[PDB]
Structure formats: structure tokens, C-alpha cells
Design a protein around this ligand. Structure first.
Ligand code: MYR
Lengths: 265, 283, 41, 68, 263
């Protein structure tokens, strides 16, 4: 027979194995698919890479300390320089993709703590100034693979234009005014260190359009929260890494133009 | 017409999200990993028409190798009469390339093709007229009498196989059927030829260890059959062997270091087979 | 390293792994040559 | 009493099929009665790598965990 | 109904071995020991088939796995020469043949690490520890009994110290790199997952049957592949116990008991 805990995910030129996963989630019960002719918007001849963009990429790792309040990513953004997925989103005006999101975090049996991994469509976050609304720079809004962080202090500045262009990423309100305890409405999986060392979520493209412009819109974001604190009891300050590995799937593009080169720092 | 079987073809395959895990296994089981590219990456359909022809044991072994070189001296000097003929123990041991291939297996059974090659020159500073030479290769089975001299009676070869070669003709050649007493030749023998019994307890003297103590394939007695001439001829006789129709059993690794003699003995000056690498991360 | 190796209390912090290499089923060779790894005087 | 068999595909023989034409054949006659005197045996690619690579008493599957 | 490859019960004669944690079992070359067939037989004498008397497991003296150990050496028909009926029959009968079940045991806690490769080598011929003569080892040193011998990591040939084997670990005592030891039927006791290994051994020789007092057709080699380690100490020790049974034992030719040179 086969266990539920043990699994192998293969896409493109890459494979991820795991021996401790709580199955896998297919958000809303649907798999990424290619656009059906009957729903297509553009009349351009689409580009459909098979095994170029559709491979797993590993994002820069983050560290889980007992003082972290969480981490976040905008999904298309976190893969913007990732080989061919990166190049195709900049060469084409339009693009669409689903994703396989795999989150990894090791701990020993003497460790405790839990990470909630949530995928939030349209993960819109609040500005960090009380003098303006819906105010955030392109650059701060789209940090890349680095992601961003959550805090537990709301310290807006109604006078400092620079800080006001950063997000007000409160952990308990998920950066947008919603209590985190209701985050569970979104597809999610929990990396409870006494149960799992990983989580996998399959993500369909979800939008009001069949296809959109990737340099403008982040279809989904990734939120990871320390639902339960990390502890080891054999140290004053334990630390374990968290690594997020992502593959686009059933990817297509249209609107070929000169490569887009966004404002950056 | 029957097409020889090819090596494994690759089927096309797509992505996987299942509980099956071809990539994870155990080797503690004694099994090698069994994964192929279609188990870990997406693949295209490729028809494989290649065959393992050169890797077959017949192909691997089917080359003549020089095994030994014998030295014959045809001379008018009385002090060199004893060198007019020579006697060699039959073995593959003398040359590294052939014993190395054979030692990949613990046991083997094969017929043997032998070819001899003769080369001659004048070792003297003063060369001169010499008539064309003829050579005799006589096989002396274990227990058979051996010549004490080049003109001894044993050269009559009344019971022994004997091949005569006139110098300058095509190199002489013959086929020898498998002759082992066992049902295969053993390339190794972890044991003694005789069991020493209680009452004769010594460490030294136990020179009966290894296959070397139980293998006697006779000797090749090689003779110039000509009368001595005023000008000395020095002849190099190369003995070649080609195992054929060979079956092997119980594979073992090849030797990493230089051989010391007939057994598996190591040389203390040469037990370091690998090169140094600058670092584990060198590439 | 992916993530990191995590070691619990009173457990060794220096581990080893053994790498192995082998041919796959889709594998062959084309032509013999003398081995360069051994010699004699 | 000759035997006829098939030659290894040559340089201009572009069929990797190895079954095209009557021109890919050769004839062998044995001239000696002692079998040791005969030429090399016919190539035989029969193999059984599992003998050395997975000599496991119990059945092992690639997809199943090796240890259950 | 809950059966698992992880556990096993091996019963031969009056001896049972149970295992909770093992990686299947290995049958070398895919073959089981069998009796000599009528179609393949040298001796004329009716055979002796001790059956259940000799076909039981015997336990060899254990050895300690230390952090400085380099390996252990046994010869198979030799290690059992003084063990029960199998031992007596090989001394009484000129010829004999047997297969074996080799079971290697090594328990450790979950906090210990290390691994042992267990290899069975047909014709395990070893190099001598002297440069004066080749293939020169005493009968006694080449046949240590259940005690076995050990591997070293240095070579210091003599010019009595010479008549013993030059048992280098990295060259397997014969000039062959250990990484290729895996060619031979083998199993690994990885303390991470297993506490034992089992290998079924067919009789292997160039002969149907041979003289056991002269020829050791199989040897047993155990090497650390990975060192033993435990956080609590610089010198953890784990005993390794080797348990062996003959299989399908057969003997031919009854003479006076052979008594080999002893010590
Ligand atoms: C007139 C010359 C006849 C020579 C006959 C020589 C017989 C050689 C027997 C085969 C040697 C086998 C060596 C081996 O594989 O160990």
C-alpha cells in the first residue's frame, strides 16, 4: 500500500518528495487548466511553454525565530526573475498561470510550533500612512522572492512620505483589517511541527478575467503565520528555516512586445 | 531475420502529484536504486536502437593479449648452450592487462586461442651470415618429462603436442579446449593446497595458500631447432592468448593497485590508487 | 542544503551520507580501449 | 553443411532495423571437428541484471516505499 | 492482514531468529541452497545429509563497534568449524557442501548514528603482511575461527609477523577499493532504519563439492561505512553479533577425523 504522508510531485525538470505531508489541497476543488476556446478574450496566438516555466523554483529562505510575526509574498511577483517564467511574464503583456505551492519547514520531535500557510487571492494590503489611502509604491508593493514580513505594531506615519509607501503589515489583521483567525476561509494547510514538515497547495488561476497583465496584478499572495510559537527547550532562542518552493503550471501568454522592465531598486 | 534486443527506450511522461514515490527507496535492502528519467523528470518518447554489443563478455574478452615474452639464444659459445631453449610456466599472471580483465570474475570457463610471434636480432657487435631459423614449441603437460637440454630426447614429442614454425611465415596459432579439472577455472582460491595436520605446527612453510598452489597447466618448452651458427641469434618469443566462448561467474571489482607476483599481494610503495582533489566542492 | 539539517538535543551534529553511482537501463558503450589505470614495468 | 546468419550493420547500411535485404548475411562453415576450433559464438544479448542489482527475497516495487 | 517487510521470523532446525527492524532479506544471485542433483555429481559414495542436526544457527563471538574500528573479518566455513555438529561433520568428512544464512545483528538507540556494510565475498583471498614472499600466510592465521580477525588502516609488512593477512580496510585486504565492495551480495545496517541484515548464500564454487578443511568458499566482511557516533560520549560502543546457519548441508567420504594444525 501507500501512505498519505509520503508523496512525490514532478513537474518539468524538477521533483519534490516528502515523507511528512498532510495530503495536499486543491483549492476550490479545481486544477489549473488552459483557457478553453469558448472563454478566450485575446485573439492572439498564445504561447504555451511546456517544461520551461513549469518547473519548481526555490525562493530565498526565511528564518523562523520565536519573535517572527509572519512572512508574505505576492505570487507572480515572487517568480519575476525565475528563469523562463520570469522572462515570459516580462516579454508578454498578458499571461496566466496556476501554481503548485510547496512550503517546507523541518524540526525535531522535541520542537513545537505551527505554521499556517494560506493562499489569498487578491491579497490587498493597507498603506502605512494615515494621510493617504491605497498608497504604496510599486517597489514596496512588489518585493520579489524576498517577500515581506508581518509585524504586530501599527506605526503609520502621517508625515513621513517614505514609510507611508510601505505596507502596514499587521499580523493579527493580515495587513488588511481582517482578523487572522478567519484566514482559514482561504485554502490553507498547517505545518504543525509534530505532524508535518511540509504543505502543498494546488492553485487554479482565479480572476474576473480569463487572462490579465502580470506586471500589474498579483493573482494570489502567500501568507505564512506562526499560529503556534516555536520552542525547543534546549536553547534560549531556537531557529528553524522556512522555505517556499513554487512552480507555475498550465501557463500561457499573449501580447508579445518588448521586454517590460519595471521600476526597481 | 531477428533484430538483436536494444537497451531501454524512454516513454513519454507528464507531471505527477501522487503518493507513488519512485525517487525514494532504501539501499539497505541490498538493492540498487531502480529509478530511470521517466520517474523523476518529464520525458519525450525516444526509441532506443542501441545494443550492448561491445559490452558482451565475448566481446570484452575476445582480444589476444600478450602474456609473456621468452628469450632463446642460438649460439656457438659453449657457455650459452643452456640458453638455446627455454621453459615457461603457463599462466596469464605475467601480464597485467589480461589478468585484470579475467579478475573481474571469480570463476570462468573458456576455450583458449594461442598465437606466437617471433622476433629475432643479433645481440653481438659482429653480425654475419646466418641461415633461416626454425622454432619448436612443445607442450609438456603436468607430470610429463622436461628436456634438460635443447637436444634432449623429450623434444621428439611422441606424446606431446608440438608446433613447428619456420621463421618468416605467418605467426603459428592453435586452439586449446577448456582443460580445467574443475567445472570452471577458479581465478581465486581462498584456501590451501594441503591441510597441515596437528603434529607439524609452523607458520613458515605454508606456501600452499592461494590458487597458485593448485594450478599446473604444464609448460611451454621452446627451442631453436637449428645448429649453432658463428653469429649469435637472440630470439624474442611473444606468447599471446585470447579467451573465447567464455562464461563467467560471480563478479567482483577490478584491482585498484599494482600487482605483486602471482597472488593478490600489495606493494607497500603503491597502495594509493586515487588522486587528490582540492576540495569536496571542486567540480 | 535545502532548509537545514535539524538535530534534537543529545544527538550528533555531524552526519554523513554515502553517495552511489550506477548506470541506468538505457545505457551502453561503443568501443574497447586498454584501461589507463594499471601498469607494470 | 554451411550456416547462414546476419552481419553487424555496416557503415552504409542505414537500416537499424537489421532486417533489410539479403545482403546483410554471411556464411560460416566449420572446418574442424573439435569445437574449440570454431569461431566466436553468436552474440547473445540476453541479460538478467536483477541478479546482481536487486537480489531481494521479497518483491520490491519502484513506487511502493522500500521499507513498509 | 498487517504483514510487513520490516519484520521476519527465520526458523531453521531448532533455532529461530526474529527481527523487528530489517530491510527485507537478500538471496545472493537469486538462488537458494539446494542439494547436489544426480545430474551434477562427482562423489560416488552415498551422501550424508545431517539435515536438522547441522542446519541450525550458531552464534559467533560478538565484536564491539568502536569509533576507531575499521572492520571485521570472518571466513564462513571456518568460523563454524568448531560449532556443534556442522563442525564435527566437516572434520569427519573429506568433502562437503553447504549454503548459509548469514544474519548480522547490531542494535543502537535512535540517538546513535553510523552504518555497517555487510558483504559476502566468494573466494575472499587476502594479501599477506610480508614482502619477502607472496601468497605466504600460515594456516592458523588464515583460519581464525569464530573469533574472526580485524581490518586495519595501515600497512606494515614485515621483513612470524609476516604470516598473516594485510587486512587494509580501504583496499578490502586485497588491493581492491572498498567502494566497489557493493558488487558482492551485500546489505547495510544503517542504524537510522535497521538493526539487522540477512543474506541467503548458495554454495558457490567451480566444483560441485570440495574439501572444507582446505577451502573457504565464502568470506564475511563487515565495514563501517559511516562511523559510530553518539552525542553523550567520545567512546560509545555497540556490540555486533553474527549468527550463522548452514543450509542444505551435504557431506561425502568418511575418514578419520581430520585434526588440523592447532595453535
Ligand atoms: C604445442 C603447444 C600447446 C600448448 C597447450 C597449452 C595448454 C594451456 C591450458 C590452458 C591454460 C589456462 C590458464 C588459466 O585460465 O588459468
Amino acid at each position: 500500500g501507500y501512505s498519505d504522508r509520503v508523496r512525490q510531485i514532478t513537474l518539468g525538470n524538477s521533483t519534490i518528495t516528502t515523507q511528512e505531508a498532510a495530503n495536499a489541497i486543491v483549492a476550490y476543488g479545481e486544477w489549473p487548466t488552459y483557457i478553453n476556446d469558448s472563454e478566450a478574450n485575446p485573439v492572439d496566438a498564445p504561447t504555451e511553454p511546456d517544461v520551461s516555466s513549469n518547473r519548481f523554483y526555490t525562493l530565498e529562505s526565511v528564518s523562523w525565530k520565536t519573535t517572527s510575526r509572519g512572512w508574505w509574498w505576492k505570487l507572480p511577483d515572487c517568480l519575476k526573475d525565475m528563469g523562463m517564467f520570469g522572462q515570459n511574464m516580462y516579454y508578454h503583456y498578458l499571461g496566466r498561470s496556476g501554481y503548485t505551492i510547496h512550503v517546507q519547514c523541518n524540526a525535531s520531535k522535541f520542537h513545537q510550533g505551527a505554521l499556517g500557510v494560506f493562499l489569498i487571492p487578491e491579497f490587498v494590503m493597507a498603506c502605512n500612512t494615515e494621510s493617504k489611502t491605497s498608497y504604496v509604491s510599486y517597489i514596496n508593493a512588489n518585493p520579489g522572492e524576498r517577500g515581506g514580513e508581518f509585524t504586530n505594531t501599527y506605526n503609520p506615519s502621517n508625515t513621513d512620505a517614505s514609510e507611508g509607501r510601505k505596507f502596514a503589515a499587521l499580523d493579527y489583521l493580515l495587513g488588511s483589517g481582517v482578523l487572522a483567525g478567519n484566514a482559514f476561509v482561504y485554502p490553507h494547510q498547517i505545518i504543525n511541527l509534530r505532524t508535518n514538515n511540509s504543505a502543498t497547495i494546488v492553485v487554479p488561476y482565479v480572476n474576473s478575467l480569463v487572462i490579465d497583465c502580470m506586471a500589474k496584478h498579483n493573482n494570489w499572495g502567500i501568507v505564512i503565520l506562526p499560529l503556534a510559537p516555536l520552542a525547543f527547550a534546549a536553547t534560549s532562542s531556537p531557529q528553524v528555516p522556512i522555505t517556499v518552493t513554487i512552480a507555475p503550471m498550465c501557463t500561457e501568454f499573449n501580447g508579445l512586445r518588448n521586454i517590460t522592465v519595471p521600476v526597481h531598486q | 531475420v531477428s533484430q538483436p534486443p536494444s537497451t531501454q527506450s524512454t516513454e513519454a511522461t507528464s507531471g505527477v502529484n501522487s503518493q507513488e514515490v519512485p525517487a525514494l527507496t532504501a539501499v539497505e535492502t541490498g538493492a540498487s536504486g531502480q529509478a530511470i528519467p521517466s520517474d523523476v523528470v518529464e520525458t519525450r518518447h525516444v526509441v532506443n536502437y542501441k545494443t550492448r554489443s561491445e559490452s558482451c563478455l565475448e566481446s570484452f574478452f575476445g582480444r589476444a593479449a600478450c602474456v609473456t615474452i621468452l628469450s632463446l639464444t642460438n649460439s656457438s659459445k659453449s657457455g650459452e648452450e643452456k640458453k638455446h631453449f627455454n621453459i615457461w610456466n603457463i599462466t596469464y599472471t605475467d601480464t597485467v592487462q589480461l589478468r585484470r580483465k579475467l579478475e573481474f570474475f571469480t570463476y570462468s570457463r573458456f576455450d583458449l586461442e594461442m598465437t606466437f610471434v617471433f622476433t629475432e636480432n643479433y645481440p653481438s657487435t659482429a653480425s654475419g651470415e646466418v641461415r633461416n631459423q626454425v622454432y619448436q614449441i612443445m607442450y609438456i603437460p603436468p607430470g610429463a618429462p622436461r628436456p634438460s637440454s635443447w637436444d634432449d630426447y623429450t623434444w621428439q614429442s611422441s606424446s606431446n603436442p608440438s608446433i613447428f614454425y619456420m621463421y618468416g611465415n605467418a605467426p603459428p596459432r592453435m586452439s586449446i579446449p577448456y582443460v580445467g579439472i574443475a567445472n570452471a577455472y577458479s581465478h581465486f582460491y581462498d584456501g590451501f593446497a594441503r591441510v597441515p595436520l596437528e603434529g607439524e605446527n609452523t607458520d613458515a612453510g605454508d606456501t600452499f595458500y592461494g590458487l597458485v598452489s593448485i594450478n599446473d597447466f604444464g609448460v611451454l618448452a621452446v627451442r631453436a631447432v637449428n645448429r649453432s651458427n658463428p653469429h649469435t641469434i637472440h630470439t624474442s618469443v611473444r606468447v599471446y592468448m585470447k579467451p573465447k566462448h567464455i562464461r563467467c561467474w560471480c563478479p567482483r571489482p577490478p584491482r585498484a593497485v599494482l600487482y605483486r607476483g602471482e597472488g593478490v599481494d600489495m606493494i607497500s610503495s603503491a597502495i594509493l590508487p586515487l588522486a587528490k582533489v582540492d576540495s569536496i566542492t571542486t567540480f | 542544503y535545502q532548509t537545514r539539517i535539524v538535530v534534537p538535543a543529545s544527538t550528533p551534529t555531524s552526519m554523513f551520507m554515502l553517495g552511489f553511482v550506477s548506470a541506468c537501463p538505457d545505457f551502453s558503450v561503443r568501443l574497447l580501449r586498454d584501461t589507463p589505470h594499471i601498469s607494470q614495468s | 553443411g554451411a550456416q547462414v546468419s546476419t552481419q553487424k550493420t555496416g557503415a552504409h547500411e542505414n537500416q537499424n532495423v537489421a532486417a533489410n535485404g539479403s545482403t546483410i548475411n554471411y556464411t560460416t562453415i566449420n572446418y574442424y571437428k573439435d569445437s574449440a576450433s570454431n569461431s566466436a559464438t553468436r552474440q547473445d544479448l540476453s541479460q538478467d541484471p536483477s541478479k546482481f542489482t536487486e537480489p531481494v527475497k521479497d518483491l520490491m516495487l519502484k513506487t511502493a516505499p522500500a521499507l513498509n
